[PDB]
Amino acid sequence: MTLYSKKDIVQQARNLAKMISETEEVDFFKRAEAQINENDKVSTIVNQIKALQKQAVNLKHYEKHEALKQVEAKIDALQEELEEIPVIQEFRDSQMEVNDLLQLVAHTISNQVTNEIITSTG
Amino acid sequence: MTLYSKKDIVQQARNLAKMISETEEVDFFKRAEAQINENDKVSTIVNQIKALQKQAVNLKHYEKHEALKQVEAKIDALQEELEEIPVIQEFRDSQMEVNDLLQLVAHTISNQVTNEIITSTG
Ligand SMILES: [Cl-]
Ligand SMILES: [Cl-]
């Protein structure tokens, strides 16, 4: 008889989220994230970036656009460097596993809902 | 002890999908879709569009690009007309309710997974 309400759907979505939080994928992400916070080269580059971001806000505000563009290029060069660090590559692989899982859930749900609608139209 | 596997997550995602299929939102979509298939003006416009789409493939293949562009404009004019029909507006409102529900589920899951990761980093 009774149709599920949106509160019922959302409550079960929070149950699914808690199960996703207890996966090897989210486990690997948590472990990969803890390693980046213990890497000296990561520390150095993030701190250079943060100092530059500080100069960038100043330069934007005084309309020193040429100097701003040099600062933004240097931020882009440091961001590129960060991505080459193997603890950062491992963290990116772990982020991709979590995002791939959420995407598989959404697609699974979307496809099955669409399927059940199509079969109902007869 | 044991972490959920991706099969476990996906099986529960299919359980969530079946609950979404038994909502007032999906109920309204199914009822709104059945009405469009019983509307004479919808029938007439969809059949004009389909005939034009047939001419369009021909004209594209012979590289009659000027005539193709007239045919594509007429398809666009008929598509606009379809959207003004109140059974089509009702169907669009119902499609938006279903899509809004799936989006609320994905965001609910995404936010809660992110939240639980942030709280774990301490
Ligand atoms: Cl399917
Ligand atoms: Cl939150």
Coordinates of N, CA and C and ligand atoms in Angstrom, one line a residue:
Chain A
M1 N 0.9 -1.2 0.0 CA 0.0 0.0 0.0 C 0.9 1.3 0.0
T2 N 1.5 1.6 1.1 CA 2.0 3.0 1.4 C 3.3 3.2 0.6
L3 N 3.4 4.4 -0.1 CA 4.7 4.8 -0.8 C 5.7 5.3 0.2
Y4 N 6.9 5.1 0.0 CA 8.0 5.7 0.8 C 8.0 7.2 0.6
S5 N 8.2 7.9 1.6 CA 8.3 9.4 1.6 C 9.8 9.8 1.3
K6 N 10.1 11.0 1.0 CA 11.5 11.5 0.8 C 12.3 11.3 2.0
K7 N 11.8 11.6 3.2 CA 12.5 11.4 4.5 C 12.9 9.9 4.5
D8 N 12.1 8.9 4.2 CA 12.4 7.5 4.2 C 13.6 7.3 3.3
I9 N 13.5 7.8 2.1 CA 14.6 7.6 1.1 C 15.9 8.1 1.6
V10 N 15.9 9.3 2.1 CA 17.1 10.0 2.6 C 17.6 9.3 3.8
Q11 N 16.8 8.8 4.8 CA 17.3 8.0 5.9 C 18.0 6.8 5.4
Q12 N 17.6 6.2 4.3 CA 18.2 4.9 3.8 C 19.5 5.3 3.1
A13 N 19.5 6.5 2.4 CA 20.7 7.0 1.8 C 21.8 7.3 2.8
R14 N 21.5 7.8 4.0 CA 22.4 7.9 5.1 C 22.9 6.6 5.6
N15 N 22.1 5.5 5.5 CA 22.5 4.1 5.9 C 23.6 3.6 4.9
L16 N 23.3 3.9 3.6 CA 24.2 3.5 2.5 C 25.6 4.2 2.6
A17 N 25.5 5.5 2.9 CA 26.7 6.4 3.2 C 27.6 5.8 4.3
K18 N 27.0 5.4 5.4 CA 27.7 4.8 6.5 C 28.4 3.5 6.1
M19 N 27.7 2.7 5.2 CA 28.3 1.5 4.7 C 29.5 1.9 3.8
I20 N 29.4 2.9 3.0 CA 30.5 3.4 2.1 C 31.7 3.8 2.9
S21 N 31.4 4.4 4.0 CA 32.4 4.9 5.0 C 33.3 3.8 5.5
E22 N 32.7 2.6 5.5 CA 33.4 1.3 6.1 C 33.7 0.4 4.9
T23 N 34.3 1.0 3.8 CA 34.8 0.2 2.7 C 36.3 0.2 2.7
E24 N 37.0 -0.7 1.9 CA 38.4 -0.6 1.7 C 38.8 0.7 1.0
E25 N 37.9 1.2 0.1 CA 38.1 2.4 -0.7 C 38.3 3.6 0.3
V26 N 37.4 3.8 1.2 CA 37.4 4.9 2.1 C 38.6 4.7 3.1
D27 N 38.7 3.5 3.5 CA 39.9 3.1 4.4 C 41.2 3.5 3.7
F28 N 41.5 3.2 2.4 CA 42.7 3.5 1.7 C 42.8 5.1 1.6
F29 N 41.7 5.8 1.3 CA 41.7 7.3 1.2 C 42.2 7.9 2.5
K30 N 41.6 7.5 3.7 CA 42.0 7.9 5.0 C 43.5 7.7 5.2
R31 N 44.0 6.5 4.9 CA 45.4 6.1 5.1 C 46.3 6.9 4.2
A32 N 45.9 7.2 2.9 CA 46.6 7.9 1.9 C 46.7 9.4 2.3
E33 N 45.6 9.9 2.9 CA 45.5 11.3 3.3 C 46.4 11.5 4.5
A34 N 46.5 10.6 5.5 CA 47.3 10.8 6.7 C 48.8 10.8 6.2
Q35 N 49.2 10.1 5.1 CA 50.6 10.1 4.7 C 51.0 11.5 4.1
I36 N 50.1 12.1 3.4 CA 50.5 13.4 2.7 C 50.8 14.4 3.8
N37 N 50.0 14.4 4.9 CA 50.2 15.3 6.1 C 51.6 15.1 6.8
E38 N 52.3 14.0 6.5 CA 53.6 13.6 7.2 C 54.7 13.7 6.2
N39 N 54.5 14.3 5.0 CA 55.6 14.4 3.9 C 56.1 15.9 3.9
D40 N 57.4 16.0 4.1 CA 58.2 17.2 4.2 C 58.1 18.0 2.9
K41 N 58.3 17.4 1.8 CA 58.3 18.1 0.4 C 56.9 18.6 0.2
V42 N 55.8 17.9 0.6 CA 54.4 18.4 0.5 C 54.2 19.6 1.3
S43 N 54.7 19.5 2.6 CA 54.7 20.7 3.6 C 55.3 22.0 2.9
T44 N 56.5 21.8 2.4 CA 57.3 22.9 1.8 C 56.5 23.6 0.6
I45 N 56.0 22.7 -0.3 CA 55.3 23.2 -1.5 C 54.0 23.9 -1.0
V46 N 53.2 23.2 -0.2 CA 51.9 23.8 0.2 C 52.2 25.2 0.9
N47 N 53.2 25.3 1.7 CA 53.5 26.6 2.4 C 54.0 27.7 1.3
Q48 N 54.8 27.3 0.3 CA 55.1 28.3 -0.8 C 53.8 28.7 -1.4
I49 N 53.0 27.8 -1.8 CA 51.7 28.1 -2.5 C 50.9 29.1 -1.6
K50 N 50.8 28.8 -0.3 CA 49.9 29.7 0.6 C 50.5 31.1 0.7
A51 N 51.8 31.3 0.8 CA 52.5 32.6 0.8 C 52.1 33.3 -0.5
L52 N 52.2 32.6 -1.6 CA 52.0 33.2 -3.0 C 50.5 33.6 -3.1
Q53 N 49.6 32.8 -2.6 CA 48.1 33.1 -2.6 C 47.9 34.4 -1.8
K54 N 48.7 34.6 -0.8 CA 48.6 35.8 0.0 C 49.0 37.0 -0.8
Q55 N 50.2 36.9 -1.5 CA 50.6 38.0 -2.4 C 49.6 38.3 -3.5
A56 N 49.0 37.2 -4.0 CA 48.0 37.3 -5.1 C 46.8 38.2 -4.8
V57 N 46.3 38.0 -3.6 CA 45.1 38.8 -3.1 C 45.5 40.3 -3.1
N58 N 46.6 40.6 -2.5 CA 47.2 42.0 -2.5 C 47.3 42.5 -3.9
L59 N 48.0 41.8 -4.8 CA 48.3 42.3 -6.1 C 47.0 42.5 -6.9
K60 N 46.0 41.6 -6.8 CA 44.7 41.7 -7.4 C 44.0 43.0 -6.9
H61 N 44.1 43.2 -5.6 CA 43.4 44.4 -5.0 C 44.0 45.7 -5.4
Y62 N 45.3 45.8 -5.7 CA 46.0 47.0 -6.1 C 46.0 47.1 -7.7
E63 N 45.5 46.1 -8.3 CA 45.4 46.0 -9.8 C 46.8 46.0 -10.4
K64 N 47.7 45.3 -9.7 CA 49.1 44.9 -10.3 C 48.9 43.6 -11.1
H65 N 48.3 43.7 -12.2 CA 47.8 42.5 -13.0 C 49.0 41.7 -13.6
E66 N 50.1 42.4 -14.1 CA 51.3 41.7 -14.6 C 51.9 40.9 -13.6
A67 N 52.2 41.5 -12.4 CA 52.8 40.8 -11.2 C 51.8 39.7 -10.7
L68 N 50.5 39.9 -10.7 CA 49.5 38.9 -10.3 C 49.7 37.7 -11.2
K69 N 49.8 37.9 -12.5 CA 49.9 36.8 -13.5 C 51.2 36.0 -13.3
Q70 N 52.3 36.6 -13.0 CA 53.5 35.9 -12.6 C 53.3 35.1 -11.3
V71 N 52.6 35.6 -10.3 CA 52.4 34.9 -9.1 C 51.5 33.7 -9.3
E72 N 50.5 33.9 -10.1 CA 49.5 32.8 -10.5 C 50.2 31.7 -11.3
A73 N 51.1 32.0 -12.2 CA 52.0 31.0 -12.9 C 52.8 30.3 -11.9
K74 N 53.4 30.9 -10.9 CA 54.3 30.2 -10.0 C 53.4 29.3 -9.1
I75 N 52.2 29.7 -8.7 CA 51.3 28.8 -8.0 C 51.0 27.6 -8.9
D76 N 50.7 27.8 -10.2 CA 50.4 26.7 -11.1 C 51.6 25.8 -11.3
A77 N 52.9 26.3 -11.2 CA 54.1 25.5 -11.4 C 54.3 24.7 -10.1
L78 N 54.0 25.2 -8.9 CA 54.1 24.5 -7.6 C 53.0 23.4 -7.5
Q79 N 51.8 23.7 -8.0 CA 50.7 22.7 -8.0 C 51.0 21.5 -8.8
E80 N 51.6 21.7 -10.0 CA 52.2 20.7 -10.9 C 53.2 19.8 -10.2
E81 N 54.1 20.4 -9.5 CA 55.2 19.7 -8.7 C 54.6 18.8 -7.6
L82 N 53.6 19.3 -6.9 CA 52.9 18.6 -5.8 C 52.4 17.3 -6.5
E83 N 51.8 17.3 -7.6 CA 51.2 16.1 -8.3 C 52.2 15.0 -8.6
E84 N 53.5 15.4 -8.8 CA 54.6 14.5 -9.1 C 55.0 13.7 -7.8
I85 N 54.7 14.2 -6.6 CA 55.2 13.5 -5.4 C 54.5 12.2 -5.2
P86 N 55.1 11.0 -5.1 CA 54.4 9.8 -5.0 C 53.4 9.7 -3.8
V87 N 53.6 10.3 -2.7 CA 52.5 10.2 -1.7 C 51.2 11.0 -2.2
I88 N 51.4 11.9 -3.1 CA 50.3 12.8 -3.7 C 49.6 11.9 -4.7
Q89 N 50.4 11.2 -5.6 CA 49.9 10.3 -6.6 C 49.1 9.2 -5.9
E90 N 49.5 8.6 -4.8 CA 48.8 7.6 -4.0 C 47.5 8.1 -3.5
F91 N 47.5 9.3 -2.9 CA 46.3 10.1 -2.5 C 45.3 10.3 -3.6
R92 N 45.8 10.7 -4.8 CA 44.9 10.9 -6.0 C 44.3 9.6 -6.4
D93 N 45.1 8.5 -6.5 CA 44.5 7.2 -6.8 C 43.4 6.8 -5.8
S94 N 43.6 7.1 -4.5 CA 42.6 6.8 -3.4 C 41.4 7.6 -3.6
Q95 N 41.5 8.9 -4.0 CA 40.4 9.9 -4.2 C 39.6 9.4 -5.4
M96 N 40.2 8.9 -6.4 CA 39.6 8.3 -7.6 C 38.8 7.1 -7.3
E97 N 39.3 6.2 -6.4 CA 38.6 5.0 -6.0 C 37.3 5.4 -5.3
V98 N 37.4 6.3 -4.3 CA 36.2 6.8 -3.6 C 35.1 7.4 -4.6
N99 N 35.6 8.3 -5.4 CA 34.7 9.0 -6.4 C 34.1 8.0 -7.4
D100 N 34.9 7.0 -7.8 CA 34.4 5.9 -8.7 C 33.3 5.1 -8.0
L101 N 33.5 4.9 -6.7 CA 32.4 4.1 -5.9 C 31.1 4.9 -5.9
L102 N 31.2 6.2 -5.6 CA 30.0 7.1 -5.4 C 29.3 7.1 -6.8
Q103 N 30.1 7.2 -7.9 CA 29.6 7.3 -9.3 C 28.9 6.0 -9.6
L104 N 29.5 4.8 -9.2 CA 28.9 3.5 -9.5 C 27.6 3.4 -8.7
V105 N 27.5 3.9 -7.5 CA 26.2 3.9 -6.7 C 25.2 4.8 -7.4
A106 N 25.5 6.0 -7.8 CA 24.5 6.9 -8.5 C 24.0 6.3 -9.8
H107 N 24.9 5.7 -10.6 CA 24.6 5.1 -11.9 C 23.8 3.9 -11.7
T108 N 24.1 3.0 -10.7 CA 23.4 1.8 -10.3 C 21.9 2.3 -10.0
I109 N 21.8 3.3 -9.3 CA 20.4 3.8 -8.8 C 19.7 4.3 -10.0
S110 N 20.3 5.3 -10.7 CA 19.7 5.9 -11.9 C 19.3 4.8 -12.9
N111 N 20.1 3.9 -13.3 CA 19.8 2.9 -14.3 C 18.6 2.0 -13.7
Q112 N 18.6 1.6 -12.5 CA 17.6 0.7 -12.0 C 16.2 1.4 -11.9
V113 N 16.2 2.6 -11.5 CA 15.0 3.5 -11.4 C 14.4 3.7 -12.8
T114 N 15.3 4.0 -13.8 CA 14.9 4.2 -15.2 C 14.3 2.9 -15.8
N115 N 15.0 1.8 -15.5 CA 14.6 0.4 -15.9 C 13.2 0.1 -15.4
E116 N 13.0 0.3 -14.1 CA 11.7 0.0 -13.5 C 10.6 0.9 -14.1
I117 N 10.9 2.2 -14.3 CA 9.9 3.1 -15.0 C 9.6 2.5 -16.4
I118 N 10.6 2.2 -17.2 CA 10.4 1.7 -18.6 C 9.5 0.5 -18.6
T119 N 9.7 -0.5 -17.7 CA 9.0 -1.8 -17.6 C 7.5 -1.5 -17.1
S120 N 7.3 -0.3 -16.4 CA 6.0 0.0 -15.9 C 5.1 0.6 -17.0
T121 N 5.6 1.1 -18.1 CA 4.9 1.9 -19.1 C 4.0 1.0 -20.0
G122 N 4.1 -0.3 -19.9 CA 3.3 -1.3 -20.7 C 1.9 -1.3 -20.2
Chain B
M1 N 34.7 -5.6 12.6 CA 35.9 -6.1 11.9 C 35.8 -5.8 10.4
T2 N 34.9 -6.6 9.7 CA 35.0 -6.8 8.2 C 34.5 -5.5 7.5
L3 N 35.2 -5.0 6.5 CA 34.8 -3.8 5.7 C 33.8 -4.3 4.6
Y4 N 32.8 -3.5 4.3 CA 31.9 -3.9 3.2 C 32.6 -3.9 1.8
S5 N 32.3 -4.8 1.0 CA 32.9 -4.9 -0.4 C 32.1 -4.0 -1.3
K6 N 32.5 -3.8 -2.5 CA 31.8 -3.0 -3.5 C 30.5 -3.7 -3.9
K7 N 30.5 -5.0 -4.0 CA 29.3 -5.8 -4.3 C 28.2 -5.5 -3.2
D8 N 28.6 -5.5 -1.9 CA 27.7 -5.2 -0.8 C 27.1 -3.8 -1.0
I9 N 27.9 -2.8 -1.3 CA 27.4 -1.4 -1.4 C 26.4 -1.4 -2.6
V10 N 26.8 -1.9 -3.7 CA 25.9 -1.9 -4.9 C 24.6 -2.7 -4.6
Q11 N 24.7 -3.8 -4.0 CA 23.4 -4.5 -3.6 C 22.5 -3.6 -2.8
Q12 N 23.1 -2.8 -1.9 CA 22.2 -1.9 -1.0 C 21.8 -0.7 -1.9
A13 N 22.6 -0.3 -2.8 CA 22.1 0.7 -3.8 C 20.9 0.3 -4.6
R14 N 20.9 -1.0 -5.0 CA 19.7 -1.5 -5.7 C 18.5 -1.6 -4.8
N15 N 18.7 -1.8 -3.5 CA 17.6 -1.8 -2.5 C 17.0 -0.4 -2.4
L16 N 17.9 0.6 -2.3 CA 17.5 2.1 -2.3 C 16.8 2.5 -3.6
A17 N 17.2 2.1 -4.7 CA 16.6 2.3 -6.0 C 15.1 1.7 -6.0
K18 N 14.9 0.5 -5.5 CA 13.6 -0.1 -5.4 C 12.7 0.7 -4.5
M19 N 13.2 1.3 -3.4 CA 12.4 2.2 -2.5 C 12.1 3.5 -3.3
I20 N 13.0 4.0 -4.1 CA 12.8 5.2 -4.9 C 11.7 5.0 -5.9
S21 N 11.7 3.8 -6.5 CA 10.7 3.4 -7.5 C 9.3 3.4 -6.9
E22 N 9.1 3.3 -5.6 CA 7.9 3.2 -4.8 C 7.7 4.5 -4.0
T23 N 8.0 5.6 -4.7 CA 7.8 7.0 -4.1 C 6.6 7.6 -4.8
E24 N 6.0 8.7 -4.2 CA 5.0 9.6 -4.9 C 5.7 10.2 -6.1
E25 N 6.9 10.6 -6.0 CA 7.6 11.2 -7.1 C 7.6 10.3 -8.4
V26 N 8.0 9.1 -8.2 CA 8.1 8.1 -9.4 C 6.7 7.8 -9.8
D27 N 5.8 7.6 -8.8 CA 4.3 7.4 -9.1 C 3.8 8.6 -10.0
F28 N 4.0 9.8 -9.7 CA 3.6 11.0 -10.4 C 4.2 11.0 -11.9
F29 N 5.5 10.6 -12.0 CA 6.2 10.6 -13.3 C 5.5 9.5 -14.2
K30 N 5.2 8.3 -13.7 CA 4.6 7.2 -14.4 C 3.2 7.7 -14.9
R31 N 2.4 8.4 -14.0 CA 1.1 8.9 -14.3 C 1.2 10.0 -15.4
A32 N 2.1 10.9 -15.2 CA 2.3 12.1 -16.1 C 2.8 11.5 -17.5
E33 N 3.6 10.5 -17.5 CA 4.1 9.9 -18.8 C 2.9 9.2 -19.5
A34 N 2.1 8.5 -18.9 CA 0.9 7.8 -19.5 C 0.0 8.9 -20.2
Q35 N -0.1 10.1 -19.6 CA -1.0 11.1 -20.2 C -0.4 11.7 -21.5
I36 N 0.9 11.8 -21.6 CA 1.5 12.4 -22.8 C 1.2 11.5 -24.0
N37 N 1.2 10.2 -23.8 CA 1.0 9.1 -24.8 C -0.5 9.1 -25.2
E38 N -1.4 9.8 -24.6 CA -2.9 9.8 -24.9 C -3.3 11.2 -25.4
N39 N -2.3 12.1 -25.7 CA -2.6 13.5 -26.1 C -2.4 13.6 -27.6
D40 N -3.4 14.1 -28.3 CA -3.5 14.1 -29.8 C -2.5 15.1 -30.3
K41 N -2.5 16.3 -29.7 CA -1.5 17.4 -30.2 C -0.1 16.9 -30.0
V42 N 0.2 16.1 -28.9 CA 1.6 15.6 -28.7 C 1.9 14.6 -29.9
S43 N 0.9 13.7 -30.1 CA 1.0 12.7 -31.2 C 1.4 13.4 -32.6
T44 N 0.6 14.5 -32.9 CA 0.8 15.2 -34.2 C 2.2 15.8 -34.3
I45 N 2.6 16.5 -33.2 CA 3.9 17.2 -33.2 C 5.0 16.2 -33.2
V46 N 5.0 15.1 -32.4 CA 6.1 14.1 -32.4 C 6.2 13.5 -33.8
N47 N 5.1 13.2 -34.5 CA 5.1 12.6 -35.9 C 5.6 13.6 -36.9
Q48 N 5.3 14.9 -36.8 CA 6.0 15.9 -37.7 C 7.5 15.9 -37.5
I49 N 7.9 16.0 -36.2 CA 9.3 15.9 -35.8 C 10.0 14.7 -36.5
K50 N 9.4 13.5 -36.3 CA 10.0 12.2 -36.8 C 10.2 12.2 -38.3
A51 N 9.2 12.7 -39.1 CA 9.3 12.9 -40.5 C 10.4 13.8 -40.9
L52 N 10.5 14.9 -40.1 CA 11.6 15.9 -40.4 C 13.0 15.3 -40.1
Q53 N 13.1 14.6 -39.0 CA 14.4 13.9 -38.7 C 14.8 13.0 -39.8
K54 N 13.8 12.3 -40.4 CA 14.1 11.4 -41.6 C 14.6 12.3 -42.7
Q55 N 14.0 13.4 -43.1 CA 14.5 14.3 -44.2 C 15.9 14.7 -43.8
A56 N 16.2 15.1 -42.6 CA 17.4 15.6 -42.1 C 18.6 14.7 -42.4
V57 N 18.4 13.4 -42.1 CA 19.5 12.4 -42.3 C 19.8 12.3 -43.8
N58 N 18.8 12.3 -44.7 CA 19.0 12.4 -46.1 C 19.8 13.6 -46.5
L59 N 19.3 14.8 -46.1 CA 19.9 16.1 -46.5 C 21.4 16.2 -46.0
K60 N 21.7 15.7 -44.8 CA 23.0 15.6 -44.2 C 23.9 14.8 -45.1
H61 N 23.4 13.6 -45.5 CA 24.1 12.6 -46.4 C 24.4 13.1 -47.8
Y62 N 23.6 14.0 -48.4 CA 23.8 14.5 -49.7 C 24.5 15.9 -49.6
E63 N 24.8 16.3 -48.4 CA 25.4 17.6 -48.1 C 24.6 18.8 -48.7
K64 N 23.3 18.7 -48.5 CA 22.3 19.8 -48.7 C 22.2 20.6 -47.4
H65 N 23.3 21.3 -47.1 CA 23.5 22.0 -45.7 C 22.4 23.1 -45.5
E66 N 22.1 23.9 -46.5 CA 21.1 25.0 -46.4 C 19.8 24.4 -46.1
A67 N 19.3 23.5 -46.8 CA 18.0 22.8 -46.6 C 18.0 22.0 -45.3
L68 N 19.1 21.4 -44.9 CA 19.3 20.7 -43.6 C 19.1 21.7 -42.5
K69 N 19.6 22.9 -42.6 CA 19.5 24.0 -41.5 C 18.1 24.5 -41.4
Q70 N 17.3 24.6 -42.5 CA 15.9 24.9 -42.5 C 15.1 23.7 -41.8
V71 N 15.5 22.5 -42.1 CA 14.8 21.3 -41.5 C 15.0 21.3 -40.0
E72 N 16.3 21.5 -39.5 CA 16.7 21.6 -38.1 C 16.0 22.7 -37.4
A73 N 15.9 23.9 -38.0 CA 15.1 25.0 -37.4 C 13.6 24.6 -37.2
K74 N 13.0 23.9 -38.2 CA 11.6 23.5 -38.0 C 11.5 22.5 -36.9
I75 N 12.4 21.5 -36.8 CA 12.4 20.6 -35.6 C 12.5 21.4 -34.3
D76 N 13.4 22.4 -34.2 CA 13.6 23.2 -33.0 C 12.2 24.0 -32.8
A77 N 11.5 24.4 -33.8 CA 10.3 25.2 -33.6 C 9.2 24.2 -33.1
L78 N 9.1 23.0 -33.6 CA 8.2 22.0 -33.1 C 8.5 21.5 -31.7
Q79 N 9.7 21.4 -31.3 CA 10.2 21.0 -30.0 C 9.7 22.1 -28.9
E80 N 9.9 23.3 -29.3 CA 9.4 24.5 -28.5 C 7.9 24.4 -28.2
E81 N 7.2 24.1 -29.3 CA 5.7 24.0 -29.3 C 5.3 22.8 -28.3
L82 N 5.9 21.7 -28.4 CA 5.6 20.5 -27.5 C 5.7 21.0 -26.1
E83 N 6.7 21.8 -25.7 CA 7.0 22.2 -24.3 C 5.9 23.1 -23.8
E84 N 5.1 23.8 -24.7 CA 4.0 24.6 -24.3 C 2.7 23.8 -23.9
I85 N 2.7 22.5 -24.4 CA 1.4 21.7 -24.1 C 1.3 21.4 -22.6
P86 N 0.2 21.7 -21.9 CA 0.2 21.5 -20.5 C 0.4 20.0 -20.1
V87 N 0.0 18.9 -20.8 CA 0.4 17.6 -20.4 C 2.0 17.4 -20.4
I88 N 2.7 18.2 -21.3 CA 4.1 18.1 -21.4 C 4.7 18.8 -20.3
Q89 N 4.2 20.0 -19.9 CA 4.6 20.8 -18.7 C 4.5 20.0 -17.5
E90 N 3.4 19.2 -17.3 CA 3.2 18.3 -16.1 C 4.2 17.2 -16.1
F91 N 4.4 16.6 -17.2 CA 5.5 15.6 -17.4 C 6.9 16.1 -17.0
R92 N 7.2 17.3 -17.5 CA 8.5 18.0 -17.2 C 8.6 18.2 -15.6
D93 N 7.5 18.7 -15.0 CA 7.5 19.0 -13.5 C 7.8 17.6 -12.9
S94 N 7.2 16.5 -13.3 CA 7.3 15.2 -12.7 C 8.8 14.6 -12.9
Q95 N 9.4 14.9 -14.1 CA 10.8 14.5 -14.4 C 11.7 15.2 -13.4
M96 N 11.5 16.5 -13.2 CA 12.3 17.4 -12.3 C 12.1 16.8 -10.9
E97 N 11.0 16.4 -10.4 CA 10.8 15.8 -9.0 C 11.6 14.6 -8.9
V98 N 11.6 13.7 -9.9 CA 12.4 12.4 -9.8 C 13.9 12.8 -9.8
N99 N 14.4 13.6 -10.7 CA 15.8 14.0 -10.9 C 16.2 14.7 -9.6
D100 N 15.4 15.6 -9.0 CA 15.7 16.3 -7.7 C 15.8 15.3 -6.6
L101 N 15.0 14.2 -6.6 CA 15.2 13.2 -5.6 C 16.5 12.4 -5.7
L102 N 16.9 12.1 -6.9 CA 18.1 11.3 -7.2 C 19.3 12.2 -6.7
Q103 N 19.2 13.5 -7.1 CA 20.3 14.5 -6.8 C 20.4 14.6 -5.2
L104 N 19.2 14.7 -4.5 CA 19.2 14.8 -3.1 C 19.9 13.6 -2.5
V105 N 19.6 12.4 -3.0 CA 20.3 11.1 -2.5 C 21.8 11.2 -2.7
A106 N 22.2 11.5 -3.9 CA 23.7 11.6 -4.3 C 24.4 12.6 -3.3
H107 N 23.8 13.8 -3.1 CA 24.4 14.9 -2.3 C 24.4 14.4 -0.8
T108 N 23.3 13.8 -0.4 CA 23.2 13.3 1.0 C 24.3 12.3 1.2
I109 N 24.6 11.5 0.2 CA 25.6 10.4 0.4 C 27.0 11.0 0.4
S110 N 27.2 11.8 -0.6 CA 28.5 12.6 -0.8 C 28.8 13.4 0.4
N111 N 27.9 14.2 0.9 CA 28.1 15.1 2.1 C 28.5 14.2 3.3
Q112 N 27.7 13.1 3.5 CA 27.9 12.3 4.8 C 29.2 11.6 4.7
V113 N 29.6 11.0 3.6 CA 30.9 10.3 3.4 C 32.0 11.3 3.6
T114 N 32.0 12.5 3.0 CA 33.0 13.6 3.2 C 33.1 14.0 4.7
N115 N 31.9 14.2 5.3 CA 31.8 14.5 6.8 C 32.6 13.5 7.6
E116 N 32.3 12.2 7.4 CA 32.8 11.1 8.2 C 34.3 11.0 7.9
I117 N 34.8 11.2 6.7 CA 36.2 11.3 6.4 C 36.8 12.5 7.2
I118 N 36.3 13.7 7.1 CA 36.9 14.9 7.8 C 37.0 14.6 9.3
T119 N 36.0 14.0 9.9 CA 36.0 13.7 11.4 C 37.0 12.6 11.7
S120 N 37.4 11.8 10.7 CA 38.3 10.7 11.0 C 39.8 11.2 11.0
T121 N 40.1 12.4 10.4 CA 41.4 12.9 10.1 C 42.1 13.3 11.4
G122 N 41.4 13.5 12.5 CA 41.9 13.9 13.8 C 42.8 12.8 14.4
Ligands
CL1 CL 19.6 -1.2 -16.9
CL2 CL 27.6 17.8 6.1

